[PDB]
Design an enzyme around this catalytic site. Sequence first.
Site, PDB file in Angstrom:
ATOM      1  N   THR A  34       0.767  -1.214   0.000  1.00 62.46           N
ATOM      2  CA  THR A  34       0.000   0.000   0.000  1.00 62.46           C
ATOM      3  C   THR A  34       0.822   1.301   0.000  1.00 62.46           C
ATOM      4  OG1 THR A  34      -1.936  -1.122   0.776  1.00 62.46           O
ATOM      5  CG2 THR A  34      -1.821   1.207   1.175  1.00 62.46           C
ATOM      6  N   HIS A  38      -8.437  -8.948   2.256  1.00 58.97           N
ATOM      7  CA  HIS A  38      -7.568  -9.735   3.102  1.00 58.97           C
ATOM      8  C   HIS A  38      -8.323 -10.890   3.820  1.00 58.97           C
ATOM      9  CE1 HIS A  38      -3.614  -7.983   2.883  1.00 58.97           C
ATOM     10  NE2 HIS A  38      -4.163  -6.784   2.863  1.00 58.97           N
TER      11      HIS A  38
HETATM   12 ZN   LIG Z   1      -3.655  -4.959   1.991  1.00 60.84          ZN
END
Ligand SMILES: [Zn+2]
Length: 808
Positions: free
Chosen positions: A159, A265
Amino acid sequence: WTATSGSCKGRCFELQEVGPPDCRCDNLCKSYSSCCHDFDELCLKTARGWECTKDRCGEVRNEENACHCSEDCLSRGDCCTNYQVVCKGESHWVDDDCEEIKVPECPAGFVRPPLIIFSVDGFRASYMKKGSKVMPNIEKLRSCGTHAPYMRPVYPTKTFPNLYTLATGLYPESHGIVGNSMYDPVFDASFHLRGREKFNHRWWGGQPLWITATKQGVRAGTFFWSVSIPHERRILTILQWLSLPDNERPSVYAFYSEQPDFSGHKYGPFGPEMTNPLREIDKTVGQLMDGLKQLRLHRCVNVIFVGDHGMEDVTCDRTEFLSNYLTNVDDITLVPGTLGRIRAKSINNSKYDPKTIIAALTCKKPDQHFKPYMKQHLPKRLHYANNRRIEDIHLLVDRRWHVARKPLDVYKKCFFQGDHGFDNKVNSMQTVFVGYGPTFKYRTKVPPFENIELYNVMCDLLGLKPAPNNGTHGSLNHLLRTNTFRPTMPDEVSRPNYPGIMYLQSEFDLGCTCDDKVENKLEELNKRLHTKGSTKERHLLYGRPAVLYRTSYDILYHTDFESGYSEIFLMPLWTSYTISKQAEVSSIPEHLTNCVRPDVRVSPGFSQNCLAYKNDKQMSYGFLFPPYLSSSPEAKYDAFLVTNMVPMYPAFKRVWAYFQRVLVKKYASERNGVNVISGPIFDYNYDGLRDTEDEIKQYVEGSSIPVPTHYYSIITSCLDFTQPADKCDGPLSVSSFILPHRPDNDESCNSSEDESKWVEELMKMHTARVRDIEHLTGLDFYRKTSRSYSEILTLKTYLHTYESEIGG
Ligand SMILES: [Zn+2]
Ligand SMILES: *[C@@H]1O[C@H](CO)[C@@H](O[C@@H]2O[C@H](CO)[C@@H](O[C@@H]3O[C@H](CO[C@H]4O[C@H](CO)[C@@H](O)[C@H](O[C@H]5O[C@H](CO)[C@@H](O)[C@H](O)[C@@H]5O[C@H]5O[C@H](CO)[C@@H](O)[C@H](O)[C@@H]5O)[C@@H]4O)[C@@H](O)[C@H](O[C@H]4O[C@H](CO)[C@@H](O)[C@H](O)[C@@H]4O)[C@@H]3O)[C@H](O)[C@H]2NC(C)=O)[C@H](O)[C@H]1NC(C)=O
Ligand SMILES: Cc1cc(NC[C@@H]2CCCO2)n2ncc(-c3ccc(Cl)cc3)c2n1
Ligand SMILES: [Ca+2]
Ligand code: NA
Ligand code: NA
């Protein structure tokens, strides 16, 4: 210390953050535990929720409400986003037909169309097709504006490295955010996802878009949002800022969503639980566009919808453990998961040894799901080495897998079904780009591109000069209706010499021999022509490459190939040749196996010598123009010139000989002719940029012949393959590679098998952009074509990935 006894009265989401110990009211105060005592009460009102209903229409203003439905709300800039729809009979933006935005239609006092970046975490490129039924607002942006089938993230596909690449135009190695966890040995300090160290400015290099704007007098909204601020409030805050007076109003804004990464996730990229977070993101887009429509800005604002990376299926049971390979596991530190980075646990332990760690992790198990690399041996396309925060030992993990140090790390620390981080070529890590507004094209699909290119374009959309970055400015001009950036070709710095015959054979004492004295006005008038360049139009199709640095070099012409020969490095910088679909492969005749021939155009003092190879027991030599592809028995002698020779380890010669004997011809067959440019690369300090001569760490023993770290080839043909490469009237097609020049084939676990089982796989792993080769060589290619320079910039940033087609 924060004296939180101040107040946020009239300061909610104030644009410049205040210095300690005064309490803060900005969109990050929550993250720093530093908001004034009344921040929640004043700045995070939630009463009555986020939508107007019929009965609230025309209500008496109640300052407690999250948003307003009273008559005064439009002038106050704080209506609910659906106010006009509910209370004034207006339609939702998504329900309106799309109508081309040919010019910006802005309210009085707007100097430039504002830019709003809507960034989504973990939004995999195939969601645009697969979730289309539940994302009508996003599908309208995509179909009405400009979109790519996908956008390539940077490595690692985590990220922070990708969001900061979006903000700066730089590779992670250059901006300094090289993973979500880092140790900087100079600061002796660690960066973590949770905590306060990550806020220290010294981690964050380059110049992000909000600083570029501010320095050039363009105001920016603050891009980052504390995670507990709900999305509806983020949108309302952007809309309120857009109502500020002209002299205070920002021109650039960002919204960020933690979805769909958060649920990806937990459930995997296509878990049935994923439909809802996609619906919710789409609703948020809807709120922004209705809100812009209320402000009369929906045909004025440029909106970018952009992801940071995708998401892959990864579960607990697909974990490799370094404890199954290494005995000394407690003397190393591993940064784990979808990539691995290894360093010594203690700098005081002198028995730690990277070479034996790597050897213990190399091709040890039949199905091994990771491959260890010294960072300087990773594929150059990853641009992942030049930073002290990147550990020397790296593990490239297969998609769908994790690596961990010990099994206890995985169960005493399943919980997860998705992850990302993998090689940025992997289909599941690709993400999205849509651009919608007056400055973007209307209903236009553009080819996939890399996210390092976006900073330049965002600077163009705002009239800013970009700071120096890794994008190639002009390569994304085809996304824009206007504000294009009209680059010019770099100036050639060194002009070549064109040597004629100047030396007698006996002046050469190179220890070279050739069986060539087996020796006519027809065929000697003709050979003079070839040495003067009479076939150069066939073999040099796009002009000579320009040399962009100061050096001394010669152009050498031949029947079958043309080269630019460096008198400084004693070998070509580049060798260019065309192979038609009809060309035939021949062998190297037995009597010529070891033939090397002095080149009478080039002095003995500026030539390599055969004796250096004889005496260097580790090092052999190959040729850049391959003798296998000679056009005739006589032309073949040219391929054995000492000026066509380059140093090659024997293990590398296996790879090179297969590429030259088998693969070039195969590509010519498949592509209807190819033009090939090959040459050496020297990058001993692994910075992705051409070495000067004093940076070379290895020479052929006893000589001044420098050993390349890599060899490249650029293979170009006609995009319309019904036209032969050498007679192409339109767009070009290219694929390129930068092969590491290694003394072993330890990278390829199947290397004891026949080259037909492993060589091409190796080359594919080391695929590259022409622009990567340009940086590594100081050359500029495609200088003379019939194509627009912007189109050529796009070709030079193209990467041939060898993945299957996105969608199944
Ligand atoms: Zn992630
Ligand atoms: C991708 O695009 C980028 C940006 O254009 C290119 O990176 C640039 O590369 C050039 C050429 O090497 C660098 O020039 C050198 O500049 C330094 C001065 O450096 C300072 O000032 C600049 C300008 O504001 C900052 O951006 C620098 O920031 C770096 O360091 C800080 C830590 O201090 C950090 O926060 C940043 O993340 C960033 O780190 C990265 O770069 C450094 C090298 O600078 C590297 O060590 C690290 O691993 C990271 O990758 C910095 O504060 C100057 O002193 C040098 O001069 C020296 O060499 C000359 C040779 O001419 C000698 O004569 C002289 O004696 C000096 O010793 C260089 O001129 C430039 O800094 C760098 N910029 C950035 C942002 O990285 C990449 O090359 C591109 N990549 C590819 C593949 O093309
Ligand atoms: C590196 C980084 C981090 C971050 N949030 C992290 C912090 C920590 C706590 C809360 O905020 N955000 N949020 C938005 C963006 C962003 C948006 C658009 C563009 Cl073009 C580029 C970056 C971004 N980038
Ligand atoms: Ca270098
Ligand atoms: Na010989
Ligand atoms: Na040798």
